[PDB]
């Protein structure tokens, strides 16, 4: 028997990605997919400097290619996803009855919700690490303006 | 002025029923398809 009509309000949460946000302009981001393959922390920079053809002094010089080396920082974020037990038990046993299809869809919905909170937490930790390594290597303006 | 008029709905919204679709199961492909639709919607926004 229908006994009450209760109204609940589910909160609408913005799920952000690292590409949907706009500080991805600053970072050219790639899928390395196995970060253990790079064991050397230092990346070799081959800065090649061009030259102006001076005819007046006649002091000819080829390009001065110098090499500096720079460290590659690595960061490690970890969140946890909480998938319940009974919904995974529903998800393993795929049913054929059209009355258990609804319970399967409910289990899929709550498992996808917990996965979406975990994935959104990882894509909010990516943005936090990117902001941290931007603000670590950002000098103030009052020095950099006249230095650069 | 960005405009002098705005487009809005011409009528009140109506409460839609959801949760009680008792249509039968098509096959294993249907439950696997709605599983792939719900799960891969995490990484696909549009």
């Amino acid at each position: 028997k229908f006994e009450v009509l209760l109204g609940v309000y589910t909160n609408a949460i913005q799920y952000v990605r690292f590409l949907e946000t706009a500080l991805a302009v600053s970072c050219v981001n790639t899928e390395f997919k196995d970060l253990s393959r790079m064991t050397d922390g230092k990346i070799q920079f081959r800065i090649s400097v061009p030259t102006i053809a001076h005819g007046d002094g006649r002091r000819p010089s080829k390009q001065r290619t110098f090499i500096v080396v720079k460290n590659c920082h690595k960061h490690h974020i970890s969140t946890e996803m909480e998938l319940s037990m009974l919904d995974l038990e529903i998800l393993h046993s795929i049913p054929e009855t059209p009355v258990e299809y609804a319970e399967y869809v409910g289990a899929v919905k709550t498992v996808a919700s917990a996965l979406q909170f975990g994935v959104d937490a990882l894509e909010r930790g990516l943005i936090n690490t990117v902001l941290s390594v931007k603000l670590r290597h950002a000098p103030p303006m009052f020095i950099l303006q006249t230095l650069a | 002025e960005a405009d002098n008029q705005i487009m809005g709905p011409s009528s009140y919204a109506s409460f839609v029923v959801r949760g009680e679709n008792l249509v039968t199961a098509v096959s294993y492909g249907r439950v696997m398809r709605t599983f792939e639709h719900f799960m891969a919607r995490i990484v696909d926004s549009p």
Binding site: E3, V4, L5, L6, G7, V8, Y9, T10, N11, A12 | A13, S14, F15, V16, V17, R18, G19, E20
Partner: peptide, 23 residues
């Protein structure tokens, strides 16, 4: 609360044909 002993068969979405949030 209100659902202290009650099951719920379905819910009524606020005209949202693809959105699950709201009243």
């Amino acid at each position: 609360s209100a659902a202290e002993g009650l099951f719920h068969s379905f819910d009524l979405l606020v005209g949202k044909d693809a959105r699950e949030a709201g009243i």
